[PDB]
């Protein structure tokens, strides 16, 4: 099922102190008598005062999309018919297509399944129709039986 994600707001971050790009400045006081006059006062205010101008630093991120992506991916992706993977580059691998190594070091591009697959549609992928959905990793029963023996 795919309703998209509810991400109508940004989640900017910020710097640890709230301000990093600060700028030094110095006290300024109006000169007496003559109008528009100015001069320097260093009696009480220290010579150097750090000050920021404008907004502060921040880095944007989209949360719900990332959470979904991650999920869809994990599950559906790393379980599509093998006819859709390809060997890794310059890394040792096994040859028997039924070992752990072969099922582990194979890789599969996320583009096959991402957060834009048949949007707004309740549906199941054709490649998955003829692949066992109990050899998944959420057979609550299988998980329980594995846990009860121990870790």
């Amino acid at each position: 099922e795919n309703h998209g994600t509810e991400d109508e707001l940004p989640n900017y971050c910020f710097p640890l102190g709230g301000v990093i790009n600060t700028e030094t400045l110095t006290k300024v006081k109006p000169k007496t008598g003559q109008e528009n006059g100015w001069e320097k006062d260093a009696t009480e205010f220290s010579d150097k005062n750090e000050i920021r101008v404008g907004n502060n630093f921040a880095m944007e991120i989209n949360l719900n999309a990332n959470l979904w992506r991650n999920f869809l991916y994990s599950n559906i992706a790393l379980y599509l018919p093998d006819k859709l993977k390809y060997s890794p580059s310059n890394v040792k691998i096994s040859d028997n297509p039924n070992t752990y190594d072969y099922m582990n070091k194979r890789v599969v591009a996320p583009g096959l399944v991402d957060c834009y697959i048949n949007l707004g549609a309740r549906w199941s992928l054709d490649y998955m129709d003829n692949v066992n959905p109990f050899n998944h990793h959420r057979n609550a029963g299988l998980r329980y039986r594995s846990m009860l023996l121990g870790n």
Binding site: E8, L9, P10, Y12, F14, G18, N55, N56, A58
Partner: protein, 150 residues
């Protein structure tokens, strides 16, 4: 103190509804059985709600702060819009604290909520459902005469 169930409802209406939908109430109150309580029933769709709010008069520092000057989360989100962030940091001004050692005197507001049902009133002598017909529906006074309804 005719309110009951910690809501703003008088006892009598509560009793009438309970009777008219479960023949329950003349012998206390309790939770009616599931199969006698379907989706559109009364009891499943009855929610009481209540809150406290600041008191305008008794507290002597009440200051009606409009929306255009509530600066909580001052420098970390947009202004009257979902747009980009802005603003500087600075302790806030809203809302008042209803807890802690410096609480402000408050008043209470209660209400209830009920939906997926229409209010029912049976035409019985004592509101108890006792069959597909009624006693009052057969008495001559309402069966061999004329009447006006208001």
């Amino acid at each position: 103190g005719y309110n009951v169930a910690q809501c703003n409802m008088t006892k009598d209406w509560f009793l009438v509804q309970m009777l008219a939908n479960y023949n329950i109430g003349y012998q206390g109150f309790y939770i009616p059985e599931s199969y006698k309580d379907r989706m559109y029933s009364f009891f499943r769709n009855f929610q009481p709600m209540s809150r406290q709010v600041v008191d305008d008069t008794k507290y002597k520092d009440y200051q009606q702060v409009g929306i255009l000057h509530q600066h909580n989360n001052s420098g970390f989100v947009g202004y009257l819009a979902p747009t980009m962030r802005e603003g500087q940091a600075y302790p806030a001004n809203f809302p008042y604290p209803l807890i802690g050692k410096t609480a402000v005197d408050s008043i209470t507001q209660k209400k209830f909520l009920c939906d997926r049902t229409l209010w029912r009133i049976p035409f019985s002598s004592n509101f108890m459902s006792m069959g597909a017909l009624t006693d009052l529906g057969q008495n001559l006074l309402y069966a061999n005469s004329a009447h006006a309804l208001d």
